[PDB]
């Protein structure tokens, strides 16, 4: 009885996706990720976590004129990477980083078709670029930044309220990686969060100041 997918236009060429999962103990967690628009071509920025909801998304933008070109995911966790086997089945391309790729193959997960590593990698030159800042909610985690809007989706790194899932953290390394993300994309205007509200540049300095804190609590 989960909420439907929602589909809503962010910007111009922009569109946040938004699909649900039970949490047991947090309830329902909504999860965002992007479309972009390049052209008449779509590109995922995650998947929901079902192939039944990427299905739906893949039909909402087909029904509407646009080819779906291909799929990123910012790190290897459901939330991600639930859609990855299903666009796989449709011959659409996938993308993850070599360490998300890895991070799958351990897990027995299907892998994204296409890989990459790095710290700057263009999905697609001058429109679509991803950023690995080190790691920080996972060891692979990635962000996606469009300049020709300066919008920033950082996935499950950016936790402005408070890091969240420890499990696959590396909480020494975080403040590092959110100091770089801070310094790289600090004209930012609009930062997608995968799990809350969409906020400005305020939302990378908040992601750092969990981050330290994160880490002096681990200490003490
Ligand atoms: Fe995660
Ligand atoms: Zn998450």
Redesign the pocket.
């Given at each position: 009885s989960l909420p439907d997918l929602k589909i809503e236009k962010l910007d111009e060429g922009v569109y946040v996706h938004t699909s649900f999962e039970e949490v047991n103990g947090w309830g329902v967690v909504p999860?965002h990720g992007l479309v972009v628009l390049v052209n008449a071509e779509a590109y995922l920025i995650d998947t929901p976590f079902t192939a039944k909801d990427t299905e739906k998304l893949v039909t909402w933008f087909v029904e509407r004129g646009y080819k779906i070109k291909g799929s990123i995911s910012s790190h290897f966790?459901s939330?991600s990477t639930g859609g990855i086997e299903w666009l796989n089945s449709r011959s659409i391309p996938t993308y993850a980083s070599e360490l998300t790729n890895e991070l799958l193959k351990k897990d027995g997960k299907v892998q994204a078709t296409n890989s990459f590593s790095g710290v700057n990698y263009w999905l697609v030159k001058n429109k679509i670029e991803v950023f690995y800042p080190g790691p920080g909610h996972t060891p692979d985690n990635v962000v996606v930044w469009l300049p020709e809007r300066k919008i920033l989706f950082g996935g499950?790194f950016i936790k402005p309220y408070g890091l969240?899932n420890l499990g696959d953290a590396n909480i020494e390394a975080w403040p590092k990686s959110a100091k770089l993300l801070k310094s790289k994309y600090g004209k930012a205007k609009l930062v997608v969060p995968?799990?809350s509200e969409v906020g400005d540049a305020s939302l990378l300095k908040l992601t750092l100041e969990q981050a330290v804190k994160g880490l002096n609590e681990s200490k003490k």
């Open positions: 999860k966790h939330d499950c969240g995968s799990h």
